[PDB]
Design a protein around this ligand. Sequence first.
Ligand code: PZ5
Ligand code: TZ2
Ligand code: TZ2
Lengths: 534, 538
Amino acid sequence: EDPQLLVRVRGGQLRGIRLKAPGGPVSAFLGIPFAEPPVGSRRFMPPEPKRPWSGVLDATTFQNVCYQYVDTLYPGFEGTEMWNPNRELSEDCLYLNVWTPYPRPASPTPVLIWIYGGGFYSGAASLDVYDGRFLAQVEGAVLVSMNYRVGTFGFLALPGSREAPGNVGLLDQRLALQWVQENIAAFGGDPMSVTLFGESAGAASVGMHILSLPSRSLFHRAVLQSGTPNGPWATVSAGEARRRATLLARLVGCPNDTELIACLRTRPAQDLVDHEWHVLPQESIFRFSFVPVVDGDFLSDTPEALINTGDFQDLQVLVGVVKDEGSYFLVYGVPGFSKDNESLISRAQFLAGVRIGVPQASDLAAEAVVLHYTDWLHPEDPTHLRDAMSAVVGDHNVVCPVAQLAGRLAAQGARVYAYIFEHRASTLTWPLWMGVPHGYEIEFIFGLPLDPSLNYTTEERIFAQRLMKYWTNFARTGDPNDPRDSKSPQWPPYTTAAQQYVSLNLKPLEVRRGLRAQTCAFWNRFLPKLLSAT
Amino acid sequence: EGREDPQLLVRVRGGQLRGIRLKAPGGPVSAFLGIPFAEPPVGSRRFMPPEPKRPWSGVLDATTFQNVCYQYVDTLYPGFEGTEMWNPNRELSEDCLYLNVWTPYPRPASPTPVLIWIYGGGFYSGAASLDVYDGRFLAQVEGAVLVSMNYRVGTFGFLALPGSREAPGNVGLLDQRLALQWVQENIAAFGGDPMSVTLFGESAGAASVGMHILSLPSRSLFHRAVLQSGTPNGPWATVSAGEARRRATLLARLVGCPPNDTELIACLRTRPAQDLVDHEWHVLPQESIFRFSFVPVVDGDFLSDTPEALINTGDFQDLQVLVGVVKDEGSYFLVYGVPGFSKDNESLISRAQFLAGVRIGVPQASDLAAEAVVLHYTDWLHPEDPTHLRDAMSAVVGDHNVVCPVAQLAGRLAAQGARVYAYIFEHRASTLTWPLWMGVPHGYEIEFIFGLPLDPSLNYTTEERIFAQRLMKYWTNFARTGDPNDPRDSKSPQWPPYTTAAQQYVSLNLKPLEVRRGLRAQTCAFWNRFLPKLLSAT
Ligand SMILES: C#CCCCCC[n+]1c(-c2ccccc2)c2cc(N)ccc2c2ccc(N)cc21
Ligand SMILES: [N-]=[N+]=NCCNc1c2c(nc3ccccc13)CCCC2
Ligand SMILES: [N-]=[N+]=NCCNc1c2c(nc3ccccc13)CCCC2
């Protein structure tokens, strides 16, 4: 037996696997249980800590992926199938993974905890793009990633009920954070230097841990990639969550909350998944059925209220967006859009798209969007209309909620760093018009271009090494800049006055000012006044 | 006669005239100033449409400018050329319906295209006798026959009690039409071609030109039009019959006339002209800038419908139009009524002063509409920057009142069969006495079009003299042919017509013509498409 692969955690002994990374070995501990399987009567309930086990638990393989919808739109297509589950679907999925240097760090190492995205309805920590082996091997980081319940299983709520209180998927995340505090030192990780990092729904989850006091004691720094707790999609009211849970219950034949939830608990997991999408109030894109609820408990108030009133003084935050946040969402529900054609749409198709892209918009609000995003020089130009449609979706859902978050955090004492990721992977199978879609920065941050068998360019390998250094320097120090490296140029903190952010592309860092400032003034200041007063 | 200059004796329908041999830089010109075209609109004739001037006996002396129509005289900055150059230069009188004619000397042997000037002054001021409207250069240099008329302004020209016989409104526009009718009948006596008449005007003069395009009885009196920094459409050029009735009724009250329209108008007719002028400004519904009390009324007669309705539905097939704006349309109006603004300081305003200014500059805007303006014109990188706020304030006023109504007009005329040519005048006169922050204010292109830099005693630069000659050629080439371009001179950059597809316009500055696309397109989409919907809804 290898002593480097034998770890005793509070619940007992584990056995990891020595994994080969380009530059040398890594110790991986995959499929560690952090909770009692949330099955049977425990479905929809908060996670309970995993009871101790006898003997040496085998932690050499990834465990089950949480029960979720599987995309079947483009079968065989890498573009969709890379995000699809790579392990068996099961309700028994509350497991975490730990990658550490081989041998085990001599001194306590900063911990990076990954929270995946997938609109709160999908995802797994076992995906190839979330492989912590490069960050551990190259940057000496202790990387942790956990599975958390998604869809009805993680976010169906009957607010005020004891049986289905909502936000349990976030509680699974918090339980994995408590686990890190209690056991990461056994792996050589520093529980006193924990950075959460997530993308999309994962970034929204990270934001929701910033905004929930019982989570705040479990981490020190945060990275929010292409997602935020504020915004049109990350949360729902207690009323809206109650409406959707009641409708799904009706859809599956379930007719008192105790009674309704009990019936929902008798339903096979796939019956619940089969109706998940049928509870959205309007035809929409970038809207998910079961998401965090503003319960007055995990979230004491709405993320908008909490970001405006919170004290973020002793907090360091790295935030950012990709060049084309909304391009993916268009091929899913906007007529005229396809991955297989150049998607040159007509003016009518654009006006129709704005209603789907901004489903909460009134006739007047949708017109304000249309008149803002039209190029009044070429108002009928199909390329402009196609790109404007991508921008509406990306700006509304990601860029302007990010701009609002960075602004409020900066104004309220946080130390904020903002970026725009503009590099399209050479390997990308989505059409060129989609540009840099949501999530296609992750493989660079994780350092996948370092594996020579993955067919990335040399430029991309050097670029991945750069991003790995920004992220791990941020985790170590709260600053993504290299203290050893003089002349960079430096990455300035984002401030309300200077609104500085940098561009992450193949060229050296470029400092820019104002994150889509005029456009986000429209979304963040004007449009709310349009949907409020009228 | 007998010893008189034989070139200065001309007969018209009303009788004989004697003109004057004037000196222009390049040679002599014939001027016939102070020709009467209407019966003096005095006494019982006040507020009534003009009556054609009855014939006179003997030779009428037409060697001097006549009376300026009764109007408000600016006394804001005394001694200041900036304000006093627009002030009346002849006696104020209700007896003011006279016109001026400049022609080459000797008079042309063959019929010459006619240019008819309609001055601005918010429909409350102006005169055709002003130095910047001197037709001597255009007559001498370009061989033009230039006509300019005085038309009633203020209460005298535009007070209306709509539906009444005694004060029907738009009489100031009828004075203009009467002067157009006069040109048709008599211009051939001066060597002018009645079949080639181009109207040209600036600001309220341009709104007037547009209103002649939109009124059928005027359409037979001209062939081409130039609208400089003004349009019939827009927030200030017209008022509803209801609003004109409200203002006339209030003015009556303010001067002692108790509100039957006959009784009210009769009483208004007994009031000294200065009493009416003293209260003119007190009838505006809100604290505002770029809003005038007595302006054309949508009467269902001169204007069959609103200028917006008429520009959207009209057939402009056989029409050639030259339209344009100056670099800083709104800068003047800020020193007038926006707190924080002065001609004597750099006018760096605060955010609060900007929000306050938007309410004065867009007086019809609701709380939500004013916020849409504020959020559009703010630079969200430097939202507190006083220079940006100052310039944004000028832009709101200029865009709202001139640039976007012009963009709207050019678009609708172009879409409905007209040949449109658009420009942006960007040259600030070297002689200008307004501060540099005001840039190129409203009306400061006029002296270049009229060719004042050609007079060496006026202290303009050589560049400016060459530039004036260029503009005189664009304008007269347009009057002659419906195209501002010189056919002989090809390699010289050309001026493309403005179209809905390409939205092309040119820059008129010291540098050769530069073609630009989209006349403040994103911003004017806001004023012309969005803002009205913010009214139509909340
Ligand atoms: C209420 C109202 C209208 C405000 C805008 C008009 C400003 N204005 C006035 C004036 C000032 C206060 C209340 C009402 C009117 C004015 C009042 C008098 N007595 C004489 C001249 C002017 C005046 C002259 C020119 C100009 N552009 C605005 C003016
Ligand atoms: N929303 N939803 N996303 C599910 C679709 N799968 C994809 C995901 C991400 N990016 C994608 C980009 C293109 C296509 C599918 C994608 C980011 C991480 C979450 C999952
Ligand atoms: N409107 N009104 N303005 C009264 C002041 N007179 C001026 C005029 C014009 N420009 C001016 C520019 C600055 C100051 C007064 C001006 C355009 C021609 C009509 C009159």
